Write a protein that binds this ligand. Structure first.
Ligand SMILES: *[C@@H]1O[C@H](CO)[C@@H](O)[C@H](O)[C@H]1O
Ligand SMILES: [K+]
Ligand SMILES: [K+]
Ligand SMILES: [K+]
Ligand SMILES: [K+]
Ligand SMILES: [K+]
Ligand SMILES: [K+]
Ligand SMILES: [K+]
Ligand SMILES: [K+]
Ligand SMILES: [K+]
Ligand SMILES: [Mg+2]
Ligand SMILES: [Mg+2]
Ligand SMILES: [Mg+2]
Ligand SMILES: [Mg+2]
Ligand SMILES: [Mg+2]
Ligand SMILES: [Mg+2]
Ligand SMILES: [Mg+2]
Ligand SMILES: [Mg+2]
Ligand SMILES: [Mg+2]
Ligand SMILES: [Mg+2]
Ligand SMILES: [Mg+2]
Ligand SMILES: [Mg+2]
Ligand SMILES: [Mg+2]
Ligand SMILES: [Mg+2]
Ligand SMILES: [Mg+2]
Ligand SMILES: [Mg+2]
Ligand SMILES: [Mg+2]
Ligand SMILES: [Mg+2]
Ligand SMILES: [Mg+2]
Ligand SMILES: [Mg+2]
Ligand SMILES: [Mg+2]
Ligand SMILES: [Mg+2]
Ligand SMILES: [Mg+2]
Ligand SMILES: [Mg+2]
Ligand SMILES: [Mg+2]
Ligand SMILES: [Mg+2]
Ligand SMILES: [Zn+2]
Lengths: 104, 50, 92, 213, 71
RNA sequence: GGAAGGGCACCACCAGGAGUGGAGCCUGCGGCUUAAUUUGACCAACACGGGGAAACUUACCAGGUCCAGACAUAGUAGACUGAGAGCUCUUUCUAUGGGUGGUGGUGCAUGGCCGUUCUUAGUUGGUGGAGCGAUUUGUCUGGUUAAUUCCGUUAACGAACGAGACCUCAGCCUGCUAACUAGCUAUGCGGAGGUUCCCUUCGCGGCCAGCUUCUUAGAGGGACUACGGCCUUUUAGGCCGCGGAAGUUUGAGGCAAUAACAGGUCUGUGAUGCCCUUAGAUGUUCUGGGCCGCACGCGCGCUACACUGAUGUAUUCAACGAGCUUAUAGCCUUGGCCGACAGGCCCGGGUAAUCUUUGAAAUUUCAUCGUGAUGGGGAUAGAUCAUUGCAAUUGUUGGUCUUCAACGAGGAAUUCCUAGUAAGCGCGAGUCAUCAGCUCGCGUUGACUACGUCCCUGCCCUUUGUACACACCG
RNA sequence: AGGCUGAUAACCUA
């Protein structure tokens, strides 16, 4: 009857990602469901280092470009229908919500 | 006409923005030349921190 | 540009059926992603339309973007010999 | 299925490419930006333009064409992506809109000195803490030179530049060459976060007035 | 060096001018007062203002100062 | 300015360390040679154009194709060959104007971007004062600061930029939030050892053992020179010290003013003016060669000249990061098997804190070698095997045996650097089918010397001289 | 021939 449902959230903005995580956890505490999380995976830092100059003249200066990806994992012990209702709420821009049934 | 294989090497790959075949950034599948990427780096989502 | 008559109809049919079309600037591509006609023939055929103002052309990131105009719709209907009440999908 | 690293990069590349396509297709329609709102079952694209009446076209003919071509170009499922036009609330605080506005004034034939001051004066009247317009290229003589029109406050260095400075760069293809337009507008602190950044300047310290009760 | 800039010095004098009664000789207490009676964007700036204001309070105890007007 | 006074910088010196310059080799540049050896650039060019070119790249050279010449007007099986590519056979367009393309020229026509002046602290309105005026004062005698940083003086008063603040990473939190993609402790069961209990050690299990110290990452706290002594003018501030994770703006970065350069880039761009060419093409494609060619000069480097070592064992500890279309399978690869190696075959995992990752070297340890160019050094060269690819010859690279050059610490000269720094040691990433002696990051081992000065090379500010202003390269 | 100088002379080294 009760199943462990895993919700994964990814985003480039920390505040938006944290805001959605609080809403889901707070939205599940209202239904008195068991909640495990949020679990914060290590931040993925995509890095691109490139020559600033469009040509090869001058001092060799480099720009270090970073694109940080923050990942959150939330586990809810409830039926898929209840989880669907909680996650149906509008999500902040840039936050990707992925709901899957944990294989255990 | 165009019979020579183009399965690998610089000739097969070109910048997706300008079409130039030099200084292609293949990391993460960007497929953009170093000049085009720097111009569009902010829009793509890359930022300079340090 | 000697486009086969069979291929020419497909481009006009697709262009008239949907008021927009696009093509990658890759003359070596064997087949257009949306039409069986070779990619090169699509680019060259709509270049003729651009010169005659039948379409409006935009280029960006190695891709063409063509939009049918009022004159283009009139020309295609006569060329395709279709009822005057049929219009491109963009006009509905 | 693709890894997270490539998916985010792919999303970024889509936004960059989409903006460039609209920047040229809607060049003479006041295009000022775009917002991509990907949602389940539907991806929403919001186009910001000073003159929305021209972007939509007659009975929304043009907007449908943009939706159709975008859907085919980017391998979207039919009837799964929508384009919505929107109007800029404060046209005078958008550097991109002002840069394009100055671009067409020069193309028409208006003098550089007069056109630049018109944009500079308009931006300040709109409630901007400051502005700066730079035009470079072959103005009248064969040799190129730069004219700088500045007024009000302005900052160059530090993190606050990202939040308080709105900058745009555009090219004017004239008969004798290319002119370079650079519009730099410094926004004002807006606690509501609409006209300008909500966060104050780091060096701005405010002392609450004491109360007598 | 550790010379306070105009931002730190100017803000510190203003706080003491209109909150001399609240201010004390303890840095830890003073920095909590600044949060209540002022909006300082950064923590580091707040600490510098609190420390310099505490220095000014010690100055006032021994005698009058130049840039502070206590009615 | 080979004038004076003050201040400052390891792209300056001092005290030092590592060196470079000498040798071999790698790579870049010049020259020579060449059908071509494409070309830009000469502190601020020369492992730079992310330029590690077998084809492509490709711009060069020797040849063959193709039109991928819109739009508008007027007119009417054989021979050859590198290859039957094209041209015949067989089977079933041409002018004119106007375009298009061009890594063609011009960066001294331009946009944008970047470098540099310039890492220093500098720059500029308003009103008022002074001067016929250029211009000046404000922007300063003095003290102080990394700082035009501040305290003060005061014909100036009040502001705008830069500096600072700020943003990112690192250093403290036994406190908060909480984790089966991270762990610990305890417990249960099992294996082994020692004396059935017990002790030591290892494995496995428990979403109802518990918990968050270790790991991860959100929110906050924490330093302010706070406190003590002394020196400074009542100042600004400085020196030393307790405590403290931290007392150099705590460390390192990012961002970064005015005014400039005929600095670089037209070979990043469907950025671009004009010029040139456009079908016996400077367009495009195909084949082959070249970009690497070697009497010589130069720059960045790699490996060394050994015993503080090489070799053979035993032993053992990181961090940053990266990874697939699943087609039998194109990415990172565990495990099993075959092989001396290289490599091959099979079953699989991982679109990832889940799998690769149980994840390095220097070093540590024992033995051998023994001052001999020696078991130092590994250039040059022969034979042969395998791998990537459509293609390996002018060796792509990787293995096996053999061959075993200079080099014994480097002339004049010259570079970098003040602490987890120098240096040593390896790893990941970029380029990438294959190829790293390069670049961008990462950790591991871990110092000497200084805590200054303006002597050299430069920079900032005042006074002063000037016949300079293209500004002493006058 | 190399070094020194932005470059030449002068100077220094081989
Ligand atoms: C143009 O206006 C938009 C309005 O949303 C603003 O977001 C941009 O920053 C500005 O350039
Ligand atoms: K040497
Ligand atoms: K270089
Ligand atoms: K330029
Ligand atoms: K004045
Ligand atoms: K046991
Ligand atoms: K350019
Ligand atoms: K040109
Ligand atoms: K390029
Ligand atoms: K050898
Ligand atoms: Mg500032
Ligand atoms: Mg700063
Ligand atoms: Mg020093
Ligand atoms: Mg030097
Ligand atoms: Mg010395
Ligand atoms: Mg050496
Ligand atoms: Mg030499
Ligand atoms: Mg040497
Ligand atoms: Mg310099
Ligand atoms: Mg190669
Ligand atoms: Mg070639
Ligand atoms: Mg060729
Ligand atoms: Mg060509
Ligand atoms: Mg070109
Ligand atoms: Mg120039
Ligand atoms: Mg005056
Ligand atoms: Mg903890
Ligand atoms: Mg904190
Ligand atoms: Mg500057
Ligand atoms: Mg020049
Ligand atoms: Mg070369
Ligand atoms: Mg170098
Ligand atoms: Mg040996
Ligand atoms: Mg280990
Ligand atoms: Mg020997
Ligand atoms: Mg290189
Ligand atoms: Zn490009």
């Amino acid at each position: 009857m009760i199943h462990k449902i895993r919700i994964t959230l990814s985003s480039k903005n920390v505040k938006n990602l944290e805001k959605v995580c609080a809403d889901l956890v707070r939205g599940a505490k209202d239904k008195r469901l068991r909640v495990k999380g949020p679990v914060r995976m290590p931040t993925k830092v995509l890095n691109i280092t490139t020559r600033k100059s469009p040509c090869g003249e001058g001092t060799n200066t480099w720009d270090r470009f970073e694109l940080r990806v923050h990942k959150r994992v939330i586990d809810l012990f409830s039926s898929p229908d209840v989880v669907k209702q909680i996650t149906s709420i509008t999500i902040e821009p840039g936050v990707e919500v992925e709901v899957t049934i944990a294989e255990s | 006409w165009n019979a020579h294989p183009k399965n690998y090497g610089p000739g097969s790959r070109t910048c997706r923005v300008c079409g130039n075949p030099h200084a292609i950034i293949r990391k993460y599948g960007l497929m953009c030349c170093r000049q085009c990427f720097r111009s569009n780096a902010k829009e793509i989502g890359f930022i300079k921190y340090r | 540009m000697i486009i086969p008559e069979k291929n020419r109809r497909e481009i006009s049919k697709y262009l008239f059926q949907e008021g927009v079309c696009f093509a990658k600037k890759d003359y070596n591509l064997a087949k257009h992603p949306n039409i069986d006609v070779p990619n090169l023939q699509v680019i060259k055929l709509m270049q003729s339309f651009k010169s005659k103002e039948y379409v409006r052309e935009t280029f960006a990131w190695m891709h063409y973007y063509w939009y049918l105009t009022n004159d283009g719709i009139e020309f295609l209907r006569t060329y395709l010999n279709l009822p005057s009440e049929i219009v491109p999908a963009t006009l509905k | 299925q693709m890894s997270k690293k490539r998916k985010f990069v792919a999303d970024g590349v889509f936004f960059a490419e989409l903006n460039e396509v609209l920047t040229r297709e809607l060049a003479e329609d006041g295009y000022s930006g775009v917002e991509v709102r990907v949602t389940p079952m539907r991806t929403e694209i919001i186009i910001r333009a000073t003159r929305t009446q021209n972007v939509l076209g007659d009975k929304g003919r043009r907007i449908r064409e943009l939706t159709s071509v975008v859907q085919k170009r980017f391998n979207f499922d039919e009837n799964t992506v929508e384009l919505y036009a929107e109007k800029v609330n404060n046209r005078g605080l958008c550097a991109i809109a002002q840069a394009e506005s100055l671009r067409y004034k020069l193309l028409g034939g208006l003098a550089v000195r007069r056109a630049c001051y018109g944009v500079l004066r308009f931006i300040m009247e709109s409630g901007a803490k400051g502005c700066e317009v730079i035009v470079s290229g072959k103005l009248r003589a064969q040799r190129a030179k730069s004219m700088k029109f500045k007024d009000g406050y302005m900052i160059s260095s530090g993190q606050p530049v990202k939040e308080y400075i709105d900058s745009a760069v555009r090219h004017v293809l004239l008969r004798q060459g290319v002119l370079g337009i650079k519009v730099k507008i410094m926004l004002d602190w807006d606690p509501k976060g609409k006209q300008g950044p909500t966060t104050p300047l780091p060096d701005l310290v405010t002392i609450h007035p004491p109360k007598e009760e | 060096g550790r010379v306070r800039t105009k931002t730190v010095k100017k803000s510190s004098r203003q706080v003491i001018e209109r909150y001399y009664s609240k201010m004390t000789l303890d840095f830890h207490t003073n920095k909590k007062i600044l949060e209540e009676v002022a909006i300082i964007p950064s923590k580091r700036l707040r600490n510098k203002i609190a420390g310099f204001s505490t220095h000014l309070m010690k100055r006032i105890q021994k005698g009058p100062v130049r840039g502070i007007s206590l009615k």
